[PDB]
């Protein structure tokens, strides 16, 4: 079917049709252009017109221009032939390696797996990161989220995790770069090449890459998540595959949504956001999940605007994760890396019946002491430690060393820490933390604990200081 | 001796205490003023929002 461009504003193009009005979600192809310009139908304004969202810049379009109903929604190449390739929101390759030749094509809009399809197995996923493992452990086929204001560590953490987990993973992986830096995509691709996860020679790549960065018009950014998502869904269901899905940054999607929302003509909700915020997050977040058919462990980076966690975007996201790593500027500025907030990060697995009570008890042990420190903090602030009780000063000591032991060098951040990256095994973390708690190290200096792997290394660092 | 050392100690101590308090009065004002401003905007946006929906 052929409609005509009626109006154009940013990414919101209104197209009128005479004989066949395309259903909502259908992808239209604008005619008369050097490159593909897909329009996704958003609503029927009545009067035989449809209001759509462009998937690329709209410059050049002209009223009266011809548009064609694709007859379906954005459909993209799915299968193993996407492995090792970089693709667009609309599924075209952007790696200058030819067409992605697949048997099947999938549409980016699907419904979420049903209740009966859900899974409830809960297995811990050890990452080698002390704070995470101890206090807010991730879980196989689970939902993890890294909350972070600007330049706090979200991406570095994803990388480190990709390194520590993705690297030695059996199944496939899907990275989806949403609204982030182009150079990052580039940084990754080439790195992926090097360590061979991407092989440009054979069919041995384990990762499929989807990108719609900081340079795309809103509509694209608003859909790429869906795109990466789809690719992942394929491996899950069609091959009962155990997937890994990394997204940077899912905040961008919502942001993108707010960009076109006014254009769609909606009264804004709080903070200028689109009134459909939650539902949009919803029908999207709900497809990123493990099922009876397959497993999807997904790590998603969540940008926090102005550092405000009460912002509708992040706020609304907590409810979709199984484990959350809230990064803090305050901590990072203190020099603690990863800048994880220990009293603010949580995990549905932090249950004695799952991590064992030994784990459970150190975990809550640690938090309790930090909480305690916390109350003392008002006073230490005006009057310092002097006026403190002998007992109080002891929590403080311990807390300052527990606080220091929570930091750790990542390989990925070697260039900045000036130290060699470390991976600590769970039992090593459970342990090192007991001892600290248990006063086994009240003699060592704080500094000894800073920036180390296992406790054993902390003892040594103490000798070196002394 | 124990009085020179004491009156010495209190001195310095109270010296840093106000030094701490100051760093705080200066810090809190900023939070104040950021909130002050934000509150005003927040309201106006609400008004405008409702007016515009008529």
């Amino acid at each position: 079917t052929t409609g005509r461009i009626v109006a154009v504003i940013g990414a919101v193009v209104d197209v009128q049709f005479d004989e066949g009005l395309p259903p909502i979600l259908n992808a239209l192809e604008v005619q008369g252009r050097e490159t593909r310009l897909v329009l996704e139908v958003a609503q029927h304004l009545g009067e035989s017109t449809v209001r759509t969202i462009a998937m690329d810049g709209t410059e050049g379009l002209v009223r009266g221009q011809k548009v064609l109903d694709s007859g379906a929604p954005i459909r993209i190449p799915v299968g193993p032939e996407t492995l090792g390739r970089i693709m667009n929101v609309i599924g075209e390759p952007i790696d200058e390696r030819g067409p992605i030749k697949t048997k099947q094509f999938a549409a980016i809009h699907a419904e979420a797996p049903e209740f009966v399809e859900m899974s409830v197995e809960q297995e811990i996923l050890v990452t080698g990161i002390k704070v995470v493992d101890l206090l807010a452990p991730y879980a196989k086929g689970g939902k993890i989220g890294l909350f972070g204001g600007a330049g706090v560590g979200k991406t570095v953490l994803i990388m480190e995790l990709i390194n520590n987990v993705a690297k030695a993973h059996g199944g496939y992986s899907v990275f989806a770069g949403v609204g982030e830096r182009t150079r990052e995509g580039n940084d990754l691709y080439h790195e992926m090449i090097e360590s061979g996860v991407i092989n440009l020679k054979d069919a041995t790549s384990k990762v499929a890459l989807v990108y719609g960065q900081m340079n795309e018009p809103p509509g694209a950014r608003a859909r790429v998540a869906l795109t990466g998502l789809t690719v992942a869904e394929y491996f899950r269901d069609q091959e009962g595959q155990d997937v890994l899905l990394f997204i940077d940054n899912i905040f961008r999607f919502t942001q993108a949504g707010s960009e076109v929302s006014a254009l769609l003509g909606r009264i804004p909700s709080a903070v200028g956001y689109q009134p459909t915020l939650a539902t949009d997050m919803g029908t999207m977040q709900e497809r990123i999940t493990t099922t009876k058919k397959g497993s999807i462990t997904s790590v998603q980076a969540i940008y926090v605007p102005a550092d405000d966690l009460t912002d509708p975007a992040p706020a609304t996201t907590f409810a979709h994760l199984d484990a959350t790593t809230v990064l803090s500027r305050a901590i990072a500025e203190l020099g603690i890396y990863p800048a994880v907030d220990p009293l603010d990060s949580t995990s549905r697995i932090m249950d004695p019946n799952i991590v064992g009570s030994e784990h459970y008890d150190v975990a809550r042990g640690v938090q309790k002491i930090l909480q305690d420190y916390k109350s003392l903090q008002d006073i230490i602030a005006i009057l310092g430690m002097d006026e403190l009780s002998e007992e109080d000063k002891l929590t403080v000591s311990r807390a300052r060393k527990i606080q220091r032991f929570l930091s750790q060098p990542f390989q990925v951040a070697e260039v900045f820490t000036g130290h060699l990256g470390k991976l600590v095994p769970l039992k090593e973390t459970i342990k090192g933390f007991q001892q600290i708690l248990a006063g086994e190290y009240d003699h060592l200096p704080e500094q000894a604990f800073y920036m180390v792997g296992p406790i054993e290394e902390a003892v040594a660092k103490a000798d070196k200081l002394a | 001796e124990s009085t020179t050392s004491e009156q010495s100690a209190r001195m310095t101590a109270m010296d840093n205490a106000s030094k701490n308090a100051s760093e705080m009065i200066d810090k809190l004002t900023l939070t104040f003023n950021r909130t002050r401003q934000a509150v005003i905007t927040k309201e106006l946006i609400e008004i405008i929002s409702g007016a515009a929906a008529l």
């Binding site: 002097d386 | 004491e6 310095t12 101590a13």
Partner: peptide, 14 residues
């Protein structure tokens, strides 16, 4: 609030 007075003696008193 006298600095580390009362404590300094206190500790070394035991």
């Amino acid at each position: 609030l006298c600095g580390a007075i009362h404590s300094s003696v206190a500790k070394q008193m035991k």
